[PDB]
Each structure stands twice: as C-alpha cells, then as structure tokens.
C-alpha cells in the first residue's frame, strides 16, 4: 500500500496547488495498469506461450489471459483464432508493489536508462512505455532465458492532458528524460 | 593511427594566421599544407587544404584538429 497512501496524502496536495480547480476529486488518478507481452507467432507458440506466460506471472501474483486474434492478420497470417498474446489487468494491490518495482526493481536494474521519452500521449494523456528488454526480478527464467525480453506497460490513468500525466508520475519520481 | 605527441602545427599555416589576426574569412585559404593541426584563432575558417589535384575549402570545427586536416579531404574517389 506504499503508493496508495502516497496518493491520498501529499500526491493530491502537490498536484492541487499546481493545478487549482473548484474541485479536488476531479484529480487524476492512476486506473489499472496492463502488462502485455505479445508472444506473437503460432509455429511453436503453444510451448513458447508457456514461457511468455510464466514471466508475466513473475511480476503479477495472478496468471494472465492470452488474447486471440482480433480483426485481420497480415503476412503473419493464421486466422482470427489462435492465442498469440498474453496480457493481464492489474489490481490496486498489484499496482503499488509494481510501482516499487518500477523504480526499486526496474531502474536500479537496467541495461541502461538515461530516461526514455519526455512525453507520451494517448488522447487523454496517458503514459505508455516499453522497457524494450525486461528487467530481472525473482524468476528462474533468466536461467532459461525468455523468448522475447521486453514488454509494454500502459498506465491507464484518468486524465485529460499529458501536462499532468507526467506530474502525477513524477510524484514518487519516474524520472524519464531530465 | 597516430600523431605521436609532436603534431605538425605547420609554418605554411603560420603565415596564414598572421594574415588572419586582423581578418576573419576573406578568401578560401589556398593552403597546400595538409599536416597542420590549427590554433583556435584559425578555427572557424574555410581552410582550403590541397588534395593532390585542386584544393577543397573545409569549414573547420574543433574535432577536425584532433587530427590532420588532410584527412578531411578525400584524395581518391570511389564509385
């Protein structure tokens, strides 16, 4: 409940004076995150799939839900059936430990990070980020080495500009390009 | 490749500097001397180093005096 508290404490206060309104439950809060690792292919991704799964399970304390193809497949082919990604939607619980594992076990643990990007925008101003190559964690899957290291990380905060999206995520510090 | 620790300043640039401590750019400096490594006062100039055929002006930067200035003129061309 680390980041959880922080919110209800002095995140809200800080942002308040930045960005005064007539309202204070308007405030932009992080909604559920997603951790997607899209395994891809289907030639052998039913064995490859299990590894990719267990790794999302390294982070989250729950297993993920594989996603079957949506609308169209290009030169990858293989139908509108076929599971081909793995993604999981994250609890508040799962959220605050991940936020102390984003910065406590994901920036002390790095290939290299001089930031990534100043800004990100999704139409209401959310910040989505690739790690590019995934960071170690408790796992025995560094031993084995995982087919696809990196995942994506969308925050799905409820906002209206990235001009507050950043500030929100700067409160405990996600540093980015500085 | 190396310059030792005796890089050639060159004398045929020396003359240029004395005709360039009262004038900035006024010409593309007809300088046949390649083995130079020029003083800052001459940096920011179009030093026209000779490349075995005709000269070519070189808009020197500080990182083109880490090394000879000859090197920053091709003396053959490939296609």
């Amino acid at each position: 409940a680390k980041l959880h508290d922080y919110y209800k404490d002095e995140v809200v206060k800080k942002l308040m004076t930045e960005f005064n309104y007539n309202s204070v439950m308007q405030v932009p809060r992080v909604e559920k995150i997603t951790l997607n690792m899209g395994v891809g292919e289907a030639i052998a991704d039913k064995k490859l799939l299990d590894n990719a799964a267990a790794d999302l399970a390294a982070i989250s304390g729950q297993k993920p839900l594989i996603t079957k193809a949506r609308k169209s497949v290009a030169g990858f082919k293989i139908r509108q059936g076929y599971p081909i990604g793995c993604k999981v939607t994250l609890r508040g619980e799962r959220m605050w430990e991940f936020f102390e594992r984003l910065i406590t076990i994901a920036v002390p643990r790095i290939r290299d990070f001089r930031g990534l990007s100043a800004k990100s925008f999704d139409g209401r101003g959310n910040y989505s980020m690739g790690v590019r190559e995934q960071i170690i964690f408790p796992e025995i899957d560094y031993d084995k080495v995982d087919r696809v290291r990196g995942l994506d990380i969308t925050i799905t905060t409820t906002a209206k500009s990235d001009e507050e999206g950043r500030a929100l995520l700067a409160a405990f510090d996600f540093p980015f390009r500085k | 490749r190396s310059l030792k620790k005796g890089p050639f300043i060159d004398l045929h640039l020396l003359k240029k500097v004395e005709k360039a401590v009262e004038s900035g750019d006024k010409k593309p400096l007809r300088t046949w001397s390649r083995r130079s490594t020029i003083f800052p006062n001459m940096i920011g100039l179009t030093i026209a180093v000779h490349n075995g055929r005709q000269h070519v002006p070189v808009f020197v930067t500080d990182e083109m005096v880490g090394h000879k200035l000859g090197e920053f003129a091709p003396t053959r061309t490939y296609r």
Binding site: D112, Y142 | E71
Partner: protein
C-alpha cells in the same frame, strides 16, 4: 550483485566471469581482484561479502556499459559530420588500417559472395 548489465556468470573462476562484464576483460578483471584484495582461486560462485562492494565500485571507475557504448558510437558520427576519412569509411563499411581491400577485408565487406 549482478550490477550494471544483466547476468554475472558463475560455475567458474572470479577473474574469468569478471571478463564477462561488457567492458571488463582479461587484465581489467585481475586488476579489480588485486584492488579488492581477493583471490581468483575462489570462484564468483562464492561471491564474497567484501567482493560484493568492489563489483560496482571498480566498474564505476571504468568506462563501461551504456556509458562507453554511448561515447564510442557518438564519435562514429562526430567525424562523419566533418568529412573525415575515418568518417565516410564507416558508411562504406571500409577499414581505416590500410588493410587489403584488393583481396581481403571480409569483416568490412562481409564474406565472399
């Protein structure tokens, strides 16, 4: 730790596995060991509670990792911007050592085709 750069290998001598620390190599290994006053007869497997400090400390004194891999590759474009020999030779793939491109240079041109 596993420190800067993921993995430190084990099931082998301390000096060895230290050579696998992306910018540390043959000398540079035994040089940290000499520093940190510790043996190589022992493996890294054993990871001393002393050696654990000096891991990050001595690799922090050297240009290594992202830091080095930045600077070098920043400088391949540096010269390139100035019409240097060293410069353009990188975008033809060519050497800078006066090597045989009449015959050889099959690490610069890639192999025989």
């Amino acid at each position: 730790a596993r420190i800067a750069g993921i993995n430190i290998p084990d099931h082998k001598h301390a000096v060895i596995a230290l050579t696998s620390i992306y910018g540390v190599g043959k000398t540079r290994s035994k040089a940290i060991l000499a520093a940190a006053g510790i043996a190589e007869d022992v493996k890294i497997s054993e990871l001393s509670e002393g050696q654990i400090d000096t891991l990050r400390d001595e690799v922090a004194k050297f240009v290594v990792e992202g830091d080095l891999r930045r600077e070098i590759s920043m400088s391949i474009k540096r010269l390139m911007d100035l019409g240097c020999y060293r410069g353009l030779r990188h975008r033809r793939g060519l050497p800078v050592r006066g090597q045989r491109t009449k015959t050889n240079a099959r690490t610069r041109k890639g192999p025989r085709k």
